[PDB]
From Swiss-Prot:
Name of this protein: Lysozyme C
Known EC number: 3.2.1.17
Assembly with partners or alone: Monomer.
Family: Belongs to the glycosyl hydrolase 22 family.
Keywords of this entry: Allergen, Antimicrobial, Bacteriolytic enzyme, Disulfide bond, Glycosidase, Hydrolase, Secreted, Signal
Ranges where the C-type lysozyme domain occurs: 1-129
Disulfide cysteine pairs (residue numbers): C6-C127, C30-C115, C64-C80, C76-C94
Source organism of the structure: Gallus gallus
Any further remark recorded for this protein: Lysozyme C is capable of both hydrolysis and transglycosylation; it also shows a slight esterase activity. It acts rapidly on both peptide-substituted and unsubstituted peptidoglycan, and slowly on chitin oligosaccharides.
EC class of the enzyme, as a word: hydrolase
Catalytic reaction equation(s): Hydrolysis of (1->4)-beta-linkages between N-acetylmuramic acid and N-acetyl-D-glucosamine residues in a peptidoglycan and between N-acetyl-D-glucosamine residues in chitodextrins
GO biological process, one term: killing of cells of another organism
Residue numbers binding substrate: D101
Length: 129
């Protein structure tokens, strides 16, 4: 599923991301925008043979099991395919563990390079929430 901007913010808000660990809702929407273009089915291969999955491009190296990333961890205790579903619940819950890591939202390269220190509030302008 390809989310609309406001639809996603509403769903993210319902699942408790708004100001989770100090990151206002605009940050998460901006990250999703640039990570996946709001598409739950996005996949991308990393050079080390690991793969990034879903709306937030969660990586198989550490966070999910895809059965083809030898020596990797499954820290969210999920198959990576659960992260591609139209229901964003698994993605959001796994993002909560990631962002609690120590490194905050710097774990998402697109956030760091494209969202960090910008007017992230713009990403939720005009939405009913
Ligand atoms: Cl894994």
């Amino acid at each position: 599923k390809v989310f609309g901007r406001c639809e996603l913010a509403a769903a993210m808000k319902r699942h408790g991301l708004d100001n989770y660990r100090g990151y206002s809702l605009g940050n998460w929407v901006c990250a999703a925008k640039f990570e996946s273009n709001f598409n739950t089915q996005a996949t991308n291969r990393n050079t080390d043979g690991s793969t990034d999955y879903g709306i937030l491009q969660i990586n198989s190296r550490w966070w999910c099991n895809d059965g083809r990333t030898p020596g990797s961890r499954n820290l969210c205790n999920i198959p990576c395919s659960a992260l591609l579903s139209s229901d964003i619940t698994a993605s959001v819950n796994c993002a909560k563990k990631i962002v609690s890591d120590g490194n905050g939202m710097n774990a998402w390269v697109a956030w760091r390079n494209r969202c960090k220190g910008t007017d992230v509030q713009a990403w939720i302008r005009g939405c009913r929430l």
